[PDB]
Amino acid sequence: PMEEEEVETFAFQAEIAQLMSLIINTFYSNKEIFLRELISNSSDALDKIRYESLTDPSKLDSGKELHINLIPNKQDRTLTIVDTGIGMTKADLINNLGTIAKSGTKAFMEALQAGADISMIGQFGVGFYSAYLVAEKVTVITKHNDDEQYAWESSAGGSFTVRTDTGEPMGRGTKVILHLKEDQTEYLEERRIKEIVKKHSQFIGYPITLFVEKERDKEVS
């Protein structure tokens, strides 16, 4: 008791659940495209707030800088992507992250079943789920103007939660935290991240900064 937090439990829409189970339980080569999908989503969100701001500068009250940060953390085997885009409302999380059918799900599963490369995922409108190629749990923290901050979370298994987040306030935008699987820690390495960004995500119209830890003082190693 004491403190109270709204936390809502949802089932993924049946075909989304079937897709996630394929993604997780089937071997697929060329998983590095998960990063491309995340950066694409950030870029679209950033485009949206920039566009709205042409007409209403006040929409930038919550964060004037439009950018993306990539944060690998070897301490807890996470890779976080943060952007200062338009963010999502509660309904946007619920609609976009699982509760309803997505047009391309079935066809995408049929393509995978035929041997398509996982890279096609983005075209089918289910790109977010590529996170599950590398992560056993994904947390999405989001904040849209005129709404409160929310945190979506799922370790697959057919369920996800949406909670009102009173933690680290983001101002405005989305932060995706990938808890990487043991056989996917390569994505924590600066060398690998740089390689995949150069390969798949060139000319993103916003600065991308990689946070690195290379100067830690020995006295606090």
Ligand X SMILES: CC(C)c1cc(C(=O)N2Cc3ccc(CN4CCN(C)CC4)cc3C2)c(O)cc1O
C-alpha angle with apex 118: 87 to 156, nearest 5 degrees? 55
Residue nearest to ligand X (CB): 45
Can you tell me which of 86, 94, 133, 134 binds ligand X, judged by CB under 6 A? 86
Query: Is 66 an interacting residue with respect to ligand X (CB under 6 A)?
Result: no
In whole angstroms, the minimum distance from the beta carbon of 16 to ligand X comes to: 13
Which positions from 110 through 139 interact with ligand X, judged by CB under 6 A?
Answer: 128
Query: Is 69 an interacting residue with respect to ligand X (CB under 6 A)?
Result: no
Q: Which residue, 3 or 88, is less far from ligand X as judged by CB?
A: 88
Which range binds ligand X by CB under 6 A, 10-18, 34-42, 112-120, 212-220? 34-42
The site for ligand X, by CB under 6 A, has a size of: 17
Can you tell me which of 16, 41, 163, 180 binds ligand X, judged by CB under 6 A? 41
Cα–Cα nearest to 106, from 13, 11, 15, 17: 15
Query: Is 79 an interacting residue with respect to ligand X (CB under 6 A)?
Result: no
Query: Is 85 an interacting residue with respect to ligand X (CB under 6 A)?
Result: yes
155 CB neighbour count, 10 Å cutoff: 14
Query: Is 178 an interacting residue with respect to ligand X (CB under 6 A)?
Result: no
C-beta separation of 175 from 189 below 8 A:
no
Query: Is 88 an interacting residue with respect to ligand X (CB under 6 A)?
Result: yes
Q: Which residue, 108 or 128, is less far from ligand X as judged by CB?
A: 128
Q: Is 41 assigned a ligand-binding role in the annotation?
A: yes
Which range binds ligand X by CB under 6 A, 56-64, 85-93, 164-172, 199-207? 85-93
Query: Is 38 an interacting residue with respect to ligand X (CB under 6 A)?
Result: yes
β-strands 208-210, 68-73: how paired? Answer: parallel
- Residue numbers in the known binding site are 41, 83, 102, 128
Q: Which residues bind ligand X (CB under 6 A)?
A: 38, 41-42, 44-45, 48, 83, 85-88, 96, 128, 140, 142, 174, 176
